């Protein structure tokens, strides 16, 4: 999730400088009247050496450093899902968080008259359900792989299973096969020796 | 299943060794203290398995090759058993403490639930079922709470 | 997705448009002199008429440009590399190199 | 394990000795694995700072 | 006076790092291309994130043509063509990992002829001693030739 990550120290993490995420974490971290105690921990990792040590200039360098390096990238989950789903190796996984209030918008020039005209049609598209058809268009539940490939642990119990060391029985089978062959060779020779 | 299959293999391999010895009888005295009956055959195979039956009298190349493979098998099995029991007992101790809903929703050995027709039940219904909560947590609680 | 939504508006209201990428490649922040770099900067100097992307609403941005109703909700997340821990026929022989 | 040949043929005894050997093997393996566990539980501590 | 550690040339850096006990401090954008295209994958790299600096074309002082370039560069960036040129030389495709200070694959745990080698010493020593003793006892019996 996120609550543990603030506590481990074997994998460093960071984010894009002067994003909104960086200012959000700087806001939560310093605030002594925060009720949580995760946010004020994370800042002590990100800010190492005035933040110059664990931050990337732009998102793609983040994703690269995650794929090759030893690093964890903090960014909009609604983006990272598409990357996780569309990696041809399916070699990433990703975890979200529940947040509300804030959301994506369209910025108009200050005082520009169109503000209500766009809001009208946005409300219409919400009523039609088109706004959900588009999300099903761009965030389908399957692609090159499945995000639920990132999890399953309900089928583990520590006990070994018949298939789980099947390679061993191959040794006994090879023993049987070679012993049969050697017995055939002995029979073939004895059929000519005519004697023990 | 496996702990039975292993024992069942012994009941086969002894008779296989008996048949192989019958197809290739020795030049030595049959039925001697170098015994050749099925009972003895299997007893020997078994003794060798548990590493302490002692000697083996047979001298054909085929039976020696079979015995070599059986000895190897034995070694592997025992070693594995030990190595695994170690792991089990080790992880046994360190087992966190559990203090999160994520724990309760990952395990299933302890069933969990609440009073029906209640704000908590409606809350978990409304949140879990909803197929747009980034489908990561939740729904796992509802899956158990809505059983039967 | 935002091109889809903008076309679902253009076809309804007849907008013609052309699109160009902001050169600085950043959404932007206030600077020390109070001018805005990045995509918000283009809207402050009136170089472009509308901005459209993953542009999250925040009070310090909303103070200088006007936002529509929000069309999708925000959320922070993390990306991590997959681990190993797998089982195979060779696991019987793994203690020694092949 | 360092015992030699078990000398006697009676089925009444043999399929008791075939249990005694099992008991032996089990208890030995158990003890070994337990010691291993014991030591692996140590060597890992650090904590309280 | 800096004469003890520095070098005159980038090649003199790279080669000295490749073969000496040495480290080299240079532009990350060059070290990317040096690192990724090494067929040995022998290097790795680390970086420090410094904001708001860049590369630039330079001209004779006061030369009037400065502004024509500085406008044209914006048209090249805006449209969407200065990105293809960078994705051509830098498509960020480091097949082998050169960001880790360690290796992300050497963790199998399986023992190998190197790490196990010491155990073979005892067998060799025993073989040597046993042959030596056998030959000495053969010479000892040569004195009488009889059994």
Rounded CA-CA distance C6/B100 in Å is 43
Q: What is residue A90's DSSP assignment? A: -
Task: Identify the DSSP state of C45.
Answer: T
Asked whether the beta carbons of A111 and C61 are under 8 A apart, the reply is no
Chain E residues whose beta carbon lies within 8 Å of the beta carbon of residue A17: 49, 51
Nearest to C27 by CA among E113, B81, A75, B47: A75
Region of A6 please: left (phi>0), alpha (psi -120 to 50) or beta. Answer: alpha
B131 Cβ under 8 Å from any chain D Cβ = no
Q: DSSP character for A109?
A: P
Q: At what angle do helices A130-138 and C2-13 cross, to 10 degrees?
A: 140
Most A CBs within 10 Å, among B70, B127, B136, B138, to test the A interface: B136
Output Rg (C-alpha) for chain A, integer angstroms: 30
Is C92's CB within 8 Å of B134's CB?
Answer: no
Range 118-147 of B in CB contact (< 8 A) with C = 134
Token pair for A56: 């990337």
Which of C10, C19, C59 lies closest to A117, judged by CA?
Answer: C10
Write b or e for each residue in A22-34: b if 16 or more Cβ atoms lie within 10 A of its Cβ, otherwise e.
bebbeeebeeeee
Torsion (CA) E81, E83, E88, E90 in degrees, nearest 10: 160
What gap in Å lies between CA B33 and CA B36, rounded to an integer? 9
Angle at E31 between CA E27 and CA E35, to 5 degrees: 175
CB atoms within 10 A of CB C2: 16
Q: With the C-alpha atoms ordered C59, C64, C66, C70, is the resulting torsion angle positive or negative? A: negative
DSSP-derived letter for residue A6 is: T
How far is it, in rounded angstroms, from Cα B123 to Cα B130? 11
Identify the three-state secondary structure at position A78. helix
* CA distance linking residue C45 with residue C43, whole number of Å: 6
Region of A106 please: left (phi>0), alpha (psi -120 to 50) or beta.
beta
What is the distance between the alpha carbons of residues B91 and E129, in angstroms, rounded to a whole number? 46
Q: How far is C80 from chain A (nearest CA, A)?
A: 6
C52 bridge partner residues: A106
Using N-to-C axis directions, what is the helix angle for B61-93 and B38-49, rounded to 10°?
40
The three-class DSSP label of residue A85 is helix
Write down the experimental method used for this entry.
cryo-EM
Contact residues on chain A for B102, CB-CB shorter than 8 A: 1
Q: Which residues of A touch E94 (CB under 8 A)?
A: 64, 68
Sheet harboring C76-81: ordered strands across? Answer: A13-14, A72-76, C76-81, A92-95
Instruction: For residue E92, give the nearest of A55, A64, A70 by CB distance.
Output: A64
> CB–CB of E7/E18 below 8 Å?
no
Q: Which of B54, B78, B89 sits opposite D37 (nearest CB)?
A: B89
Residue written as tokens 């190993």?
C84
Question: Distance of CA C2 to CAs A138, B25, B93, C15, C26, Å?
Answer: 11, 85, 53, 15, 18
Going by C-alpha positions, the residue among B56, B25, B2, B20 that lies closest to residue A177 is B20
- For A171, which residue in chain B has the nearest alpha carbon? B69
The 10 Å Cβ neighbour count of residue B135 is 13
The DSSP output letter for A74 is E
Instruction: Give the list of residues 6+ apart from residue A77 with CB closer than 8 angstroms, or none.
Output: A94, A95, A96, A97, B134, C75, C76, C77, C78
| Surface-to-core class of residue A139, CB atoms within 10 Å of its CB (0-12 exposed, 13-18 middle, 19+ buried) | middle
**Secondary structure (3-state) at B38:** helix
CB-neighbour burial class of residue E74 (10 A; exposed 0-12, middle 13-18, buried 19+): exposed
Is A19 annotated to bind ligand? no
CA atoms of A175 and A193, how far apart (whole Å): 26
Interchain pair C20, E112: CB under 8 A: no
Q: Alpha carbon of E4 to those of C28, C80, E1, E7, E12: distances in Å?
A: 44, 43, 8, 9, 14
- Nearest 10 degrees: Cα torsion E6, E11, E15, E20: 0
Determine the Cα angle at E103 with ends E100 and E107, to 5°.
140
Task: Tell me the torsion sign for CA atoms E61, E62, E64, E69.
Answer: positive
Residues of chain E with C-beta less than 8 angstroms from the C-beta of C96: 110-111
Resolution of the coordinates, Å? 3.7
Task: Provide the total of helices (H) and of strands (E) in chain C, helices listed first.
Answer: 3, 4
The Cα–Cα gap between A30 and B141 comes to 35
* Beta carbons within 8 Å of D15's beta carbon, 6+ residues apart: none
* Region class of B13: left (phi > 0), else alpha (psi between -120 and 50), else beta: alpha
Residues C77 and A94: beta-carbon distance below 8 Å = yes
The structure tokens listed for C79 are 């990306």
Q: Which of C70, D32, E89, B127 is nearest to A106 (CA)?
A: C70
- Beta carbons of A21 and A74 less than 8 angstroms apart: yes
The whole-angstrom separation of Cα E96 and Cα A69 is 11
HSE, side-chain direction, 13 A CA sphere, residue E23? 4
Among A125, E33, A156, A154, which residue's Cα sits nearest to residue C87? A156
Q: Is A106 helix (H, G, I), strand (E, B) or coil?
A: strand
From CA A112, how far away is CA D14, in angstroms rounded?
100
3-state secondary structure of C96: strand
Q: Is A4 annotated as a binding residue?
A: no
Give the residue among B77, B67, B18, B24 at the shortest CA–CA distance from B47.
Answer: B67
Burial class of residue D29 (count of CB atoms within 10 Å of its CB; 0-12, 13-18, 19+)? middle
Q: CA quadruple C63, C65, C70, C74: dihedral positive or negative?
A: negative
Q: How far, in Å, are A4, A61, C40, C73, E134 from residue E80 at the CA level? A: 42, 20, 19, 29, 85
- Tokens 């583990």 locate to A156
**Nearest-CA distance A182 → chain C (Å):** 27
Residues 6+ away with beta carbon under 8 Å from C21: E77, E78, E79, E80
Which of C69, C52, C44, C54 lies closest to C18, judged by CA? C52
Structure tokens at A133: 């058809």
Instruction: Report CA-CA distances (Å) from E13 to A144, C11, C29, E42.
Output: 44, 60, 39, 15
Kindly write down the DSSP assignment for every residue of E52-96, as one continuous string: S-------STT-TTHHHHHHHHHHHHHHT-TTHHHHHH-----SS
Residues in chain B with CB shorter than 8 Å from the CB of A162 are: 1-2, 5
How crowded is the C-beta side of B89, counted as CA atoms within 13 Å? 19
Which residue on chain E is closest to C18 by alpha carbon? E79
Contact call for residues A63 and A73 (beta carbons, < 8 A): yes
Residue B28 exposed, middle or buried by CB count within 10 Å (0-12, 13-18, 19+): exposed
User: Rounded distance, CA E126 to CA E144, Å?
Assistant: 28
Extract the tokens encoding C94: 């793994």
Distances, alpha carbon D2 to alpha carbons B51, B54, B74, in Å: 10, 10, 18
Any idea what DSSP says for residue E39? T
**Crossing angle, helix B2-23 and helix A166-193, to 10 degrees?**
10
């Amino acid at each position: 999730s996120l609550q543990d990550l603030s506590k481990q120290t074997e994998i460093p993490y960071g984010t894009v400088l002067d994003s909104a995420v960086y200012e959000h974490v700087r806001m939560k971290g310093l605030n002594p009247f925060e009720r949580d105690s995760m946010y004020s921990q994370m800042w002590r990792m990100i800010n190492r050496s005035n933040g110059s040590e664990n931050n990337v200039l732009e998102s793609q360098a983040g994703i690269q450093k995650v794929k090759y390096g030893n690093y964890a990238f903090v960014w909009d989950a609604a983006v990272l899902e598409y990357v996780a789903i569309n990696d041809p190796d399916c070699s990433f996984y990703t975890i979200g968080n529940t947040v509300a209030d804030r959301g994506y918008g369209i910025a108009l020039q200050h005082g520009s008259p169109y503000r209500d005209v766009f809001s009208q049609r946005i409300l219409e598209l919400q009523q039609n359900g088109d706004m959900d058809i588009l999300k099903h268009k761009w965030w389908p539940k399957n692609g090159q792989c499945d995000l639920y490939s990132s999890v399953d642990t309900k089928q583990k119990g520590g006990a070994l299973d018949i298939k789980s060391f099947a390679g061993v029985f191959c040794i006994l089978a090879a023993g049987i096969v070679l012993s049969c062959f050697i017995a055939m060779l002995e029979t073939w020779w004895n059929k000519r020796k005519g004697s023990r | 299943s496996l702990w039975a299959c292993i024992a069942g293999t012994v009941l086969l391999v002894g008779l296989l060794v008996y048949l192989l010895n019958w197809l290739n009888p020795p030049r030595l005295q049959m039925g001697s203290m170098t015994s050749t009956t099925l009972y003895n055959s299997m007893w020997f195979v078994y003794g060798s398995f548990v590493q302490q039956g002692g000697e083996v009298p047979y001298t054909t190349l085929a039976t020696r090759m079979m015995m070599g493979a059986w000895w190897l098998f034995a070694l592997i099995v025992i070693s594995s058993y030990t190595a695994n029991l170690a792991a089990f007992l080790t992880i046994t101790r360190i087992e966190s403490s559990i203090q999160s809903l994520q724990d309760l929703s990952k395990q299933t050995e302890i069933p969990y639930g609440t009073v029906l027709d209640s704000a908590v039940y409606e809350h978990v219904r409304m949140k879990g079922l909803n197929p747009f909560e980034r489908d990561s947590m939740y729904s796992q609680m509802w899956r158990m709470i809505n059983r039967s | 997705f935002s091109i889809d939504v903008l076309d679902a508006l253009s076809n309804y209201l007849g907008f013609n448009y052309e699109i160009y990428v902001a050169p600085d490649h950043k959404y932007g922040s206030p600077q020390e002199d109070g001018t805005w770099n990045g995509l918000v900067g283009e809207l402050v100097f009136k170089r472009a008429d509308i901005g459209i992307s993953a542009l999250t609403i925040t009070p310090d941005r909303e103070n200088v440009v006007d936002f529509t109703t929000r069309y999708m909700d925000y959320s922070v997340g993390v990306l991590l590399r997959r681990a190993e821990k797998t089982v195979d026929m060779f696991a019987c022989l793994a203690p020694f190199d092949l």
